[PDB]
Design a protein around this ligand. Sequence first.
Ligand SMILES: [Zn+2]
Lengths: 286, 49, 53, 519, 287
Amino acid sequence: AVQKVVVHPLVLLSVVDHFNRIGKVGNQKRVVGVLLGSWQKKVLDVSNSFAVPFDEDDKDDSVWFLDHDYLENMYGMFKKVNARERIVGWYHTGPKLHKNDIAINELMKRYCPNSVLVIIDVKPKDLGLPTEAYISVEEVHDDGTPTSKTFEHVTSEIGAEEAEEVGVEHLLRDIKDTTVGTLSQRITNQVHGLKGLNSKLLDIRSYLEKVATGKLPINHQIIYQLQDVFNLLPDVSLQEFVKAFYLKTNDQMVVVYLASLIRSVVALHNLINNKIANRDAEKKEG
Amino acid sequence: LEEGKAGSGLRQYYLSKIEELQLIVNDKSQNLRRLQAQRNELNAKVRLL
Amino acid sequence: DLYSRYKKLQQELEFLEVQEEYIKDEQKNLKKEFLHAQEEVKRIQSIPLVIGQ
Amino acid sequence: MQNKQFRNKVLRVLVKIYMNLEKPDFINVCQCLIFLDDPQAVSDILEKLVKEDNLLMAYQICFDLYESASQQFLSSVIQNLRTVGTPEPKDQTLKMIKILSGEMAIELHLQFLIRNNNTDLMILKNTKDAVRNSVCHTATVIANSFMHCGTTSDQFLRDNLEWLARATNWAKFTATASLGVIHKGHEKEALQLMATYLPKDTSPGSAYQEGGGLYALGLIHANHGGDIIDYLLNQLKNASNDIVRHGGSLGLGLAAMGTARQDVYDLLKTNLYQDDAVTGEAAGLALGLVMLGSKNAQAIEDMVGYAQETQHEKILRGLAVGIALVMYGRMEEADALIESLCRDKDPILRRSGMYTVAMAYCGSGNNKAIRRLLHVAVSDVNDDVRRAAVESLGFILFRTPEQCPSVVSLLSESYNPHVRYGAAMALGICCAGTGNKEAINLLEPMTNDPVNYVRQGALIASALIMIQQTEITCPKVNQFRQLYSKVINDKHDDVMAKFGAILAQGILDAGGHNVTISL
Amino acid sequence: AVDTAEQVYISSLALLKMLKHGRAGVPMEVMGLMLGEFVDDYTVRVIDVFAMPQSGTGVSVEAVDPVFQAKMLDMLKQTGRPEMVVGWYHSHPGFGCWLSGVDINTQQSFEALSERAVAVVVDPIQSVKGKVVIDAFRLINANMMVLGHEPRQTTSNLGHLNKPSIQALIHGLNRHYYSITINYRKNELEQKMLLNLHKKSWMEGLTLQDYSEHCKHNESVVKEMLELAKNYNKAVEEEDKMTPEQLAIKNVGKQDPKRHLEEHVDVLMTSNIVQCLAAMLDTVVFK
Ligand SMILES: [Zn+2]
């Protein structure tokens, strides 16, 4: 159905507000809010949202608390002031996916249309993309397991419409734009290695552990395709790619010629002025 | 003796060569701070813009 | 004062040496601020507009 | 540029040569005692005063040792000298009594300053012409406080009562404080004159008179042994809100400076426990003064723990200056603390680290600080730490006035005007009291700018130089004329421009050229 | 008769909500409310900010429904937002950010409760995207006309309040009218979160995706751009052939505004992409 979605920073900043108004409780469990957007267009667009109280139980995990009246009131007034946005789905700040979440989402699965689930972290220590869009659909399982709600990963992007970019850029005055050049590119070319390093290290360890040491048949079948992807590159000897390396290095030579020639052109005015201005200043000095 | 007017002398002249190296540091700092003042002048110009 | 000139000059040496990393910081940062302000006044210009004479 | 690891031992082993000679020398023992600050170094020479049996030679060393260059060392040596002797018997008593007196100097200074006064009507007339009822109202009375300091003359303010109390504002507080600046060193006539104003119902409509009286009292009794502090506690015990807390913290905090008492610390804590920003800022200013040299262990963690838990900026800057001024001789100690607090998110605390490392590294003993000072000056986008940057630089480089304008020459014209302002303050404090023209010839581009901040800073910087200088040696005519044009240009300039202008003019006319400043 | 120095604290919450209110800033008159908590007299903080439904009457004291107001406020009280209303905000598109008669009248009516009553007017329509800077408004008393206008200390921030440097509206409407300074607040949480989110917004999901794409597009797309670059550079060089004549004639003064240098430098900067992505391709090929 939906190929990709658009998530604005405003809702995550509303989560920052959720971490703001806490006021030192001593509980700070997962808080379920109500996300709003436009389900009319194929691509999902998030504008703004509100917050609803959500509480659970220590021992029993099947306990979930929502409000129909508050939801209908907030959505009612929001629809009253703005008719260009309606209900879509919900989201939680919990780093882990609870089993009760299917029952929590079941409500909006009944009353509302199909809802999208978003998982974020309470502490922004994650370098990767904090927002993961998960569509709720029923898929046929190959192993023959009974049909249940399955969360499928949907690609997403973080962007703003018009004024939000200005607001962010003004409030920050730190981050820099694309700015094609040396430092902007080389920073990426440096840190990206760590971007892959910490992620892969955080992944393959728990992967290796849970595969051999673990149970609850999450359908490992896709991981054979994972390993297959890892085997899609059987150590190519580059012998066929030698010509490509030759063309690339030829382009490098072109870069060399361009650089040398252009710099040689720039050196003109400098290696003229450095003489003609100095000799004239010196002779007219006294 | 032949030290203070010899060894200490060539030591002071070695210090003069050090003053030459620090003269290189000096005028390098000079032209670098002049280029700095130039870039700051252009930045102040677009600031006026 | 002859032999004191050395030890007295060392302070000036260190003082002139400490300015290196300083002018490094200035020249590396102020160009980034330069392109920053450059793109700031560049983004001011927009395609939609009115044509006069 | 010694690290003090050797030089102190070198001097303390070099003070044994002159005691074996025919006569002692005051210059070397003074220069050493103001350096190593060792109690055992003065231990022999204090008890040799009786052995030598010479009164005239002891007066000099006693006077110049008790005059300056120590606080807790003096507080220790006074009781150390109090212990020595009876709890020439009759001569030693009057000697040991008179040497720690210090009131004589205040007497002769107040006297010669009373008889040297020379005033002109043109200046005061100009101030009364350029005065406004809002902004420069405080500038006029602070200028009056500047010129009337030491002469104890209230006759200039006895002209009219409608030039002061005509409106209710902080201007009356600054006026009373200005009066406190006018007269100093009075254990009787001060409180007497303050109580002579309205001793009727003992209930003034304006509390700024009482609070300002407390602040003035703190200004007068500062660094004295005649402290009324014992009474000031019960006077602070009175029931009020704005003036007792704030003015009391300022006055009592300034009066208790150097005492390092735990009582004033406790009451200051219970004064800052109300979470209020203003009285907590005054509490910070007072705490920084009274805790100097004490260096309490849990105080730092308590204050930095009290820092991020409040959103008010006043309490933040209050604790900032509080932890800034309290740090002395920590050069070999607090490095890790400053380095740890340098990475803090708070801009106020970031400036607080620089203000803290400022006075600690003074004397140009560390070249490491200026690295991160200039680094955080250029790199950081916030103008706060940038305008707070070169103050510490000027503080540590204050030794050589010539080298400063060269390295601040790039900060003469900066990107943001705040850096130009801080640099103006830098050229102001570094070239202060000196004859360096490197700032002076560069004052001409600084005196005219589209921004008013850098202009005002240039006025202050120009005010801190021309003071105590001969006109025949250097052509100051230009800057004097451009400074005298500021009052006639006030109509075509900014409201704060004329403020900083007359404020800059109050510097040269201060004390009638008699009193000056020295770093 | 006492007046201190007040400063309005503005967070990212109210800012972004006023940006959404900026998208809601259509010529149709709109209403808004601001909430917060007063710790003392000289400081004011705003946290909860929402919008209001549009009406045909426009902005008026009658437009505000008291029962609906108190209702929503109660709904905020039962939730985790225990803050009283600190005032109200609105938009004044295209006729200027100033206040009309009805506006100052309903302001006079709404300031009967709160002595402060912070007034904020946002007008993104004629406001360039270069600066989002906004100026908060205040209301002077009518009985202060005899005495001085503004008895406020801390005059150092007036230069920061000098941002509205327009030579008309300021000293034109200065009679019985004035403004107040604006500052922001940021902690480590918001800083790190928003910085990471924005950096990720300018980055990819796995971050290794669209890099190798351009790396392999260097031999297809960039090449044509390099050819065009050589075309423009040659178009400069043909004039550069004419330049040494002028350098052999005048040499005094510059009649050519064209720098001819920094642009070619930027061309080299675009040419360095191949070199920078070369090592990238090396890392991809290696492991
Ligand atoms: Zn209208």
